[PDB]
Amino acid sequence: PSRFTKTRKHRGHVSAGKGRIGKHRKHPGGRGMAGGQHHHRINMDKYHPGYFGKVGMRYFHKQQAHFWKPVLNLDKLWTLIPEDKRDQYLKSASKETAPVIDTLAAGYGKILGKGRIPNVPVIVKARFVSKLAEEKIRAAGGVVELIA
Amino acid sequence: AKQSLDVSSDRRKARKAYFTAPSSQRRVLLSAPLSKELRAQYGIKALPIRRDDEVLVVRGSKKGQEGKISSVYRLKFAVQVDKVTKEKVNGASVPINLHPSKLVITKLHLDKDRKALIQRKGGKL
Amino acid sequence: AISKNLPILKNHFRKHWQERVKVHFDQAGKKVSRRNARATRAAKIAPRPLDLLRPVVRAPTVKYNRKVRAGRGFTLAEVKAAGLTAAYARTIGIAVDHRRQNRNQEIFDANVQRLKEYQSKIIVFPRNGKAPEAEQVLSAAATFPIAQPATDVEARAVQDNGESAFRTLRLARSEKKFRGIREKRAREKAEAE
Amino acid sequence: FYEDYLIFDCRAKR
Amino acid sequence: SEKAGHQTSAESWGTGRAVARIPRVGGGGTGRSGQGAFGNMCRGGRMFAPTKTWRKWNVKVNHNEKRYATASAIAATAVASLVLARGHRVEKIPEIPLVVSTDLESIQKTKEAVAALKAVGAHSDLLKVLKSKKLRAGKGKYRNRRWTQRRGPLVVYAEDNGIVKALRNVPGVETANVASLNLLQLAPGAHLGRFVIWTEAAFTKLDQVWGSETVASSKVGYTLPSHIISTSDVTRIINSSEIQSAIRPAGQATQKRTH
RNA sequence: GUGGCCUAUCGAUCCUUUAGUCCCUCGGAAUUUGAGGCUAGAGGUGCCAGAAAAGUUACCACAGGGAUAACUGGCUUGUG
RNA sequence: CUAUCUAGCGAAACCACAGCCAAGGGAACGGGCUUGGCAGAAUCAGCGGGGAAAGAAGACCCUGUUGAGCUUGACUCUAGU
RNA sequence: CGUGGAGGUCAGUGACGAAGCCUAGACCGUAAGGUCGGGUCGAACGGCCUCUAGUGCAGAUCUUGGUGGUAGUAGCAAAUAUUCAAAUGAGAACUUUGAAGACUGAAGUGGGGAAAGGUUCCACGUCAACAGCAGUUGGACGUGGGUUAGUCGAUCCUAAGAGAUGGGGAAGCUCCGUUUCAAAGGCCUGAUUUUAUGCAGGCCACCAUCGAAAGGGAAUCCGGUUAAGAUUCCGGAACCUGG
RNA sequence: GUCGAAUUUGGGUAUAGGGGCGAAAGACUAAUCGAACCAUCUAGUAGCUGGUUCCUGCCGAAGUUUCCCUCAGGAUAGCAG
RNA sequence: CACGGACCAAGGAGUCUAACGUCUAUGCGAGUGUUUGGGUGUAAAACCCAUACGCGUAAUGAAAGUGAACGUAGGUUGGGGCCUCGCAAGAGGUGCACAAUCGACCGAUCCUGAUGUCUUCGGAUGGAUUUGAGUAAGAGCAUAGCUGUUGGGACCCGAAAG
RNA sequence: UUGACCUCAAAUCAGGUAGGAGUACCCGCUGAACUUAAGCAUAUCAAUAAGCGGAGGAAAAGAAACCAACCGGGAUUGCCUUAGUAACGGCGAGUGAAGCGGCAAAAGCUCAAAUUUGAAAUCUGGUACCUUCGGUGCCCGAGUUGUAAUUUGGAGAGGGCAACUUUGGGGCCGUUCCUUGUCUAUGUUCCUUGGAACAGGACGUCAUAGAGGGUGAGAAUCCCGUGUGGCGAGGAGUGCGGUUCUUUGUAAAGUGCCUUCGAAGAGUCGAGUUGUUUGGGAAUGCAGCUCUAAGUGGGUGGUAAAUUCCAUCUAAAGCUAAAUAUUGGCGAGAGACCGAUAGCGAACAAGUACAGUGAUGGAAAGAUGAAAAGAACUUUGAAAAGAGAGUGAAAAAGUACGUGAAAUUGUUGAAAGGGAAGGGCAUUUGAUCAGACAUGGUGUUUUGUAU
């Protein structure tokens, strides 16, 4: 609001904190990102490098749905299970009752192997996976079954 | 307070409705209360005033004076009574504009329509 | 114009935008009007439920194909299978979409069972007489909610047969990539004499 | 409104 | 009005006429002709930065913060240090939180309703509102804000069977349901400690509505806010026993002026 | 020994073109052309951190400048 | 005939405050400052030294990445043909 | 620190005088500013915690309004020129009458009109403002009266020209063009005697309309009359058109 | 100066703005002309000038670097909070 | 001897917005955001709410695509605080944040090119003065505020012009 | 010779219809520049303003020649998001959608192309009658160069077999909706101030009414109203709720199996080129010219081309509510808005007066007091006016009127004053002014006998 503003404090003071010499004027260097290859070149090259040019290959009618692949790291992988049953399935480190985890229904597209699930067997239903992730799952004793 | 959506609580609109009121609505605005005797005798609390009614003043500097109405000056929102006058320096008599809200009726001027209005308001005659 | 380190902004206010600024002060009054219109429509169709029965239907677009959804209409095959016509269904509170087609027995059976449950849950008053009071409701979609099909069970045994399931995807990618080259090499081999 | 003519002097100005 | 100040065809005359370069009104025969135009410093003018309707009028407050605040405001009802600080006239009250029977929810008539509160002890808090009717000072008087008065108590019900209309006309007194509980009523002016008259059913439902250590809240995901300090009286902590076992002795609280 | 004994002898984006990988894409699926991309150079901006550019106004205009001339004055005094 | 004095009538330009000089320094030519000379109410008519008097955001000159009129194998187009 | 408004409190002040304004009267504060007394005045207003903003002026050749010095000053001096008496009146350099002296000098300061103006014409009453002095006067103010046509004019005709129609262009407002590539209309005699107007004949071909108070053009003059009207009204004496 | 005509003039009528008219001065086109007037686009842009509203307290500069059709300006580093 | 100012009153100029940066306060916290909408209501308020959506939790390459532990989530130096011994001085141990540094991991680039195979596919393994806006026991989301930025009339007034 | 047809005309023929206004929103056509790019020419401003045409209460769009590449969705519109993204762009400044998903709202359909051919079954008009938003009969006419029934691609039709199932239209009375009327509580009780009580104090009442306004000053309780309910009146109306009369119909529609069929829009699609336009990129759309198709075809499938497949719709004809918009118009309600130099230009005889040839421009101007009670009367004066008196709570409210600031001026009083005045430090002189001078105290010399 207005009364915590320094405009109320600049009252009486002539130039309003803008300078007697420099004289707040309308647009004394341009409008917008003007001068990028010119009188604003140093700002652009120092703080926005890459702004000028073109870098690759186009894609007409790109829909951001063919590229839907939200990733999940193994470190979580039980957050998909409700806590009412997590401790049960962990202490029953058991095959023939191993839990099934449908990541797709949770909203995930790919599994990744960041780190250190426990040594419990688990069935992971995924669209895609990574090499290390599958290695770690079946080292824990489980399996990955692919779906779509 | 007010619950209706068709009713307004605006000073501006209400004052304009008062001052730009026509003579048919000013009749209702210029209602007067009845005395205790007439209120017990008719079962009514107020009525719209008119020209041959007898009345009594209960507020102002003419407090206590009786008299018959002489004219209902609706444009002025006021009532002129005989025997209530201002006697000027030039030996003239100017009627005093009173408000019926500061009056009390002691005696009505009766007609078929006033009787019907009373019976409509729940009176007894 | 350009100054210290701040992100390049893209603010599209170089037109006469301040002729076209729609502030929705209307929001509450309009909600009220919506509610009152719903109530009015209800009173006009006093027994009827204010919304038709829409089907259950699978969503496009692999982002959403995992989810089921409400649709437009019940796919004339489905209503015929449920034992009534579309011209009668439209008068009974059932939406019919002539332009969608059944490619999946699960969705077909689900919508058919939906129709059966609806037909048993309703009562249709004759065109003649009584008007047997029925204490209307306002949502068919609430009575027949959309149910996400259960895909599997919570716990199962482990069937690990050792092909590693990343190799699988990789080889699918590879054979899709080199399908046509291989058909061409086969054609050119068959071309030999 | 007025454009008086006597202030116009180019003698000795240039 | 967007048109305001700009319904004229004004053009600056320029330089050479011994006048300021403000745009001026053309024509003849009027008085307005020659007058300044379009400018903030000018009569008939355009104000600087004309007010727009796309000002931000309303504000998002986070839901859990609204709830924290309503809970703090409720909690400050059980503290007479705060309730007297607002001027609610509860010195003759036996105890607060003040609770009554659920037979008040079924009162249909204002006479019975107000007699109940007189018997309970809100008589002074009602009379204060009757005594405090004053004209407003600002220009609000001719903007439909002609009178000012204080607030009486806030009656709180669980189900209404006439009490809202019984107290609708009593000045100051407000009614509320436990589920809603407007903070604008519980902390008016942002001054904590309104005098609240709960009923027993409301006072019981309040656990269902906000929860406890043993039951749920009826708001999804809502756990009441936890304390960062166990008790607000810290002198007791300082002076208890164990600190004092660890503490060096004190000085004399006003140092001797050496030299 | 990663050009000239040393200190000078040279050039961005976009566009075109070439060499390289013979790799990625043309998004319903393939083959072949074509096109587009990635990596490294050339084509040139000499106002050389790189606009695409002829004059006039003694008919003139605006914003301004004593930051800047044409008088006096003042410092100076070559010249007189 | 005015000016001039009177009766009646009765404006405007302009105005930071104002109105004596010398020199000094000082934005290098001060009504004011410093140092000196001096300095006695209120005023009339004239005068044209000064007020760097008034009249106009210099019209000459320069600057502007402001223009317009005019010309032409300028740059880019175009009606017509 | 201060201002406009908003939520809250002071169950705040107030017609026994709110706010405001004046006050070389007092007190506080470094200060912004606050407070008290007195006078005036008449209806609302404030302290504290918070919210909010169209929030604080010495300037912008700032805006609008108002007022000064200048200053009772410049100045009210072109068009030859006024004077005496009386009357009126509160009052007369200026009004009215009279007497005198002068000017315009018939290419006039006369008598009439066109345009334009619009009631300024005329009477009665009348002088606050206007008449750059005055004012008893006035083109002022107030109240009223007043403009009479068969012949004067418009009206009608065409001029330069304007411009519908048909048609043609144009997205279209509209443009072109005015007798054009149009099926572009109406005039005499009658004939019948259900009868009113058809058929009987015959004729005729231009092809809207607008455009002149100075062009062309049917015809009126004298005398008298009003405060103010007149080739118009009265009186007399005529003329044209149509029937 | 000229004064019986290349005269003077009324009225009607035509020509309308990048257009008219011009015995040609860039003259006239309603006190407007090297492109009228009215309203709108339009609060047109301005690196240029002017102005920018209360108190106290603490701190306290730069007029320099490199680049820019850059030289009355900006970005950048520096000085300051 | 530069500009404005004769005088007074009243008016009179860094505002609002969309998106953002730093800092700060508040709430929740690997989640966060109720208010498009629905329900509800003492009716533009307050109260309640589902499914999504946005941002964040994974980067990297032009892209196809691939996708973060050898290790007590590393070693070394230093590091507040804590523990132990001590009367204390001091000695040792552990050492969050943070700084520096050598490494490991992910992705791109350049190599090496195993078991095998539709014999042209696959890409194990080991490397590299290469490179990334990365990992390495997550910190963000929402709101509010001062200040700053851009677009907007954009602090107020101001052209010649088109 | 006579009577028809086709085409074209005329009529003050019989009956109707269009124009113009308004235009905020809506459908279109036309179409800029200022501006930004720190210059400027593409670009941007902007597919905007101005201009032209045409509508409604909404319009338009709309039942896919759509989206997609999914386990597929399913008219159109609008919101959140998609996304400041893909893309365009002196690849610079800058511009910039769509599918998906959540929601609001939801509604679907009809013509042409078919032989009724055992019967133009269809329709306007006129006329007589009637129960008149129209119907019945009769009579001219339109029309076979095709009016009704049947069908519209989701299908469907012609035959053959077989069974079942379901129906229309008026009245009357309520209800709904609109407009509108009327009625429905409580103090004007005491004392003080005051011109007035609507203020203050006391005692009370009503309250589903303490919102608001008026009244001689802050009024729930004096008045209108408010709140709650009731009693009506007039209309619209088929929305449904009951009652009643007509039986519509040897009619209509739906459904299963078999068979033969299954017509489906051309100067159009599509292509080249030009121009414009778009986010649309070897060309998104539109238009112009030129060329001009097909029927297991055609279009789309966001990189041009050939070849081969796949998916998905079915154009060139058409109708249709709601959600959506809305500085206009009618009617309502509200505001942390402005408060007479503000707020609309306009609080008033304001788009007035006034200016201008004209288009056009375009003001200023609110408040006496409760009530005119607006100053009778006397006197001076030619009169205006004055002095008095008087009204009024007040003329320090006298129509130059609430308050009545400053600049500026007048009078009185004080003070100073030799070519400025003003100001600062310090004091004299003159004028003027605040504050502390009680306090507890031995005490009774005490009266009122404990002061």
- Residues spanned by the domain of C122: 21-126
Sign for the pseudo-dihedral over CA of B34, B39, B45, B50: negative
User: Smallest Cβ distance to A105: which of C62, C151, C168?
Assistant: C151
**Cα–Cα distance, E90 to E81 (Å, whole number):** 10
In this structure, is the CB of residue E118 within 7 Å of any atom belonging to strand H? Answer: no
Pick the closest to residue E188 from E237, E152, E136, E163 (CA basis): E152
- The nearest CA of chain B is from the CA of E134 a distance in Å of 17
* Identity at B115, one-letter amino acid code: K
Q: Which two tokens stand for residue A85?
A: 């049953």
Q: Do E128 and E150 touch, CB atoms closer than 8 A?
A: yes
Sign for the pseudo-dihedral over CA of E75, E77, E80, E84: positive
DSSP code of residue C9 = P
List residues bridging with E157 in a β-sheet. Answer: E177
**Cα–Cα distance, C45 to A119 (Å, whole number):** 62
Q: Which chains touch D (3 or more CB pairs under 8 A)?
A: none
DSSP output for E163-188: HHHHSSSSSS-EEEETTT--HHHHSG
In the structure, how far is the CA atom of residue A35 from the C1' atom of nucleotide F49, in angstroms? 12
In this structure, is the CB of residue E205 within 7 Å of any atom belonging to strand H? Answer: no
Contacts with E144 from chain B: Cβ below 8 Å: 9-11
Using only the alpha carbons of chain C, give its radius of gyration.
28
List residues bridging with E197 in a β-sheet. Answer: E98, E155
**Cα–Cα distance, A90 to A87 (Å, whole number):** 5
Residue with tokens 């009717």: E133
**Cα–Cα distance, E64 to E60 (Å, whole number):** 12
**Cα–Cα distance, A135 to A144 (Å, whole number):** 10
**Cα–Cα distance, E147 to E141 (Å, whole number):** 7
**Cα–Cα distance, E136 to E145 (Å, whole number):** 7
Q: How was this structure determined?
A: cryo-EM
**Cα–Cα distance, C26 to C32 (Å, whole number):** 10
Those residues with Cβ within 8 angstroms of residue E163's Cβ, 6 or more apart along the chain or in another chain: E104, E105, E106, E107, E113, E155, E157, E175
- The nearest CA of chain C is from the CA of A7 a distance in Å of 23
Q: Do B98 and B50 touch, CB atoms closer than 8 A?
A: no
**Cα–Cα distance, C105 to C112 (Å, whole number):** 10
Examine chains D and C and say if they touch (3+ CB pairs below 8 A). Answer: no
Resolution (A): 2.8
Q: Do A140 and A103 touch, CB atoms closer than 8 A?
A: no
- The nearest CA of chain E is from the CA of C150 a distance in Å of 25
Contacts with C59 from chain A: Cβ below 8 Å: none
Best mutation target, B9, B11, B13, to test chain E (most E CBs within 10 A): B11
Q: Which two tokens stand for residue A117?
A: 């699930």
**Cα–Cα distance, E152 to E88 (Å, whole number):** 7
Chain K: nucleotides below 7 Å from protein CB are: 36-38, 44-48, 64, 67-75, 82-88, 91-109, 154-155, 166-168, 176, 182-186, 188-189, 195-198, 206-216, 218-219, 222-228, 239-242, 254-256, 279, 281, 302-303, 312-314, 324-327, 332-335, 337-339, 341-346, 351, 353-356, 360-364, 370-376, 390-391, 393
- Show the domains of chain B with their CATH numbers: 1-125 (2.30.30.30)
Helix/strand/coil percentages in chain A, nearest 5:
20, 15, 65
Q: Do A117 and A136 touch, CB atoms closer than 8 A?
A: yes
